[PDB]
Symmetry: D3
Subunit: 144 residues, 6 copies
Amino acid sequence: MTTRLEWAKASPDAYAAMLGLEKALAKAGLERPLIELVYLRTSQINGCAYCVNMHANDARKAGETEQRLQALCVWQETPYFTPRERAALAWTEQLARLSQGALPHGLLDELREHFDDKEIAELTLAVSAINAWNRFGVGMGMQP
Amino acid sequence: TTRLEWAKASPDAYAAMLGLEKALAKAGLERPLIELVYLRTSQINGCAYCVNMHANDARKAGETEQRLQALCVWQETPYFTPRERAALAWTEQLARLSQGALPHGLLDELREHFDDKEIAELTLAVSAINAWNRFGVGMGMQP
Amino acid sequence: TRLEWAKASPDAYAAMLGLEKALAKAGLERPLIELVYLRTSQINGCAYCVNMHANDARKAGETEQRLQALCVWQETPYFTPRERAALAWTEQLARLSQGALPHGLLDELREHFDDKEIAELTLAVSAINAWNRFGVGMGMQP
Amino acid sequence: TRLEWAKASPDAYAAMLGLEKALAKAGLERPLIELVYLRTSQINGCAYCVNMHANDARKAGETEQRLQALCVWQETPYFTPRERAALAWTEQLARLSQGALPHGLLDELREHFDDKEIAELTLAVSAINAWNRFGVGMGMQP
Amino acid sequence: TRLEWAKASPDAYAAMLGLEKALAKAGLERPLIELVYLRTSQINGCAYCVNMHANDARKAGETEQRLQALCVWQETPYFTPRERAALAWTEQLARLSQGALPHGLLDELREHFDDKEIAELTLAVSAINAWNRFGVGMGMQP
Amino acid sequence: TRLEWAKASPDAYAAMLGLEKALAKAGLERPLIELVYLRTSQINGCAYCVNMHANDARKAGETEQRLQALCVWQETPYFTPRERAALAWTEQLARLSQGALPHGLLDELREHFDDKEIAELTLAVSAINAWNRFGVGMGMQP
């Protein structure tokens, strides 16, 4: 990492609070490989190069396949993802671009074809946290 | 009103999110600035639950009907301090992170008004409301 | 202001005031017109109009809760089905430059308004769209 | 038309007609106004107004080359520095809902128009923006 | 032009011409291809191509009313179902960078065209999208 | 695929292949071309092309760090000045439907490439844009 402002040095509290997001999802029932896809697809949408690099590397270390890794930015028209992963990425895409308009009503319905309500909160936790990391990532000018 | 009571489905999720709130309660950054950050991001993201909560909180604190109504269109008004306007510029750009690059001279601009600890706390504020909005919209919360 | 356009062109101003005279004599509820003006001025980024029409709406006894929730009205229970159908029209027509409007849309507001009300709502929308272009164009701050 | 808005509200029709009376009296060139009208109608997707104003410009003869190049006017050499300035304005005010307008813009047109003219141009912009909303919303088709 | 690219790379020019050579041989009707070419060049902001294909279309018959209405074709009564299907395809493939194609679109197209004609329509779309890229990139003017 | 377009139109497919034959004879580095193809397909949403060009880039060189960073290339240190100039051109021309090309942009790539190289680059950009339209349009999946 290179950065324009060492935000964990300047505010240990903020850094500790953000780790708390990670600590809660580390405990989550939701699969780590799904979460990695959510982190990776979100960081791509948000243009956070540090987080893209980080989370591609982690998904790959856990053996994520180069085929799914390269195709994730265009997942909709690929045969590579399960209906469960696809519902979670639809959620991810829409919630990454929340500034752009209303979220479709039936999206949460589609999720619950594939996930229980606890998984959905954990999923939304993951979206929420990466969107948070990306904002420090890009705002503080961090680079891989 | 909600479609999914997520704080009950995942107590860990809720605590962690409260964690962000506990950290900003300890922040040096002023609460009335945090309220405008929260209210404005909530407007941008279309979180009607959060817009309602944070408008209400700013007002009780609080904080002036003219500034609350003008906030959505702050840029072209004379109601906000140079420092508030630096933070609101930051807030607008970071709400719309999916939409493109961040103006590369922008962080330099809020360095004219905040120190680095404050920048970090501001970005924490920006990041937390962005997160709460994702919950408010995702779970279909209404005022 | 950057350019006092009413002094520059008295004719333009009186044509613009004439829009207000036509809808001052409209059978459409004033409080609703106020919400059309405020929402449109929000969408178009006209601080002068936002301040003016929030202030007039409040003066006329609109609620703070409704005034602060207007920008996110879709996901609130504060507005009547009638107000909601007008605000959906307001929103689409504010953004006319950004694509087609759904054809089912006029049929939908037809369920809430008669044809004279629709025509009057559309005048309201056009007028504030008009006022907003002068507001922003000429650099008016509130 | 799906809805006879002039029949439904005679006051709306008369107010709008009054905007056309003000600009009929204005100093600003008619051929410039027809380009403003046609370009806005293109951006707003009002097929009724595009057909009406392209026909009217052709009738006053306006020049098929300029009519066909209007929609891409920026990278053509068919338009004057004064038309280009008015068309930049037209473009920005059509799209007012999409964000703020660049502050240099009003400064730039003051290099080509005096303040009375700017007020008349802006009236033309607002007027056609208004007609387009009636045209599209009421489902007019040529 | 800012860069005479055919001279710089006669090979590039030769492969680009090969697109036009294949479409010359196509079953698909020339007047439809001109509309596709015209509408794409409008959308992509290539004034060079706009000028060229409006001119070609007209000198081949085709009708001032249809040429002025092309840019708002959707809300006009001027175009056949066959042409409407190709223009929707054209609009969407012009704006490929802006999101996904409706899955229904190809099926819709299949009601009016055979698969050979679709392939040829896609070639046409692809070719003008290619020509506009040189046209705008190399700073060519009409 | 939803439509075997090479069988429906052998002539379309031969023409498209002739674009690839021309760029195979180009001086422009193949590694640079695979990045332009890959980045364009990402932007245009062609999963078929993204798979193919990710795979060919990896075969041949080239280095997971770069493949995964490409979609966010601007904010990485992984790409050379020459490559960054070509990727700015690629991004802009991918999104031609969205506005005017920045006016100093050719002159910037001109600091890194001679004119032949910038007919070849623009040929690559144009060809992958064309391939993406067949891929998305015919509903091809990897």
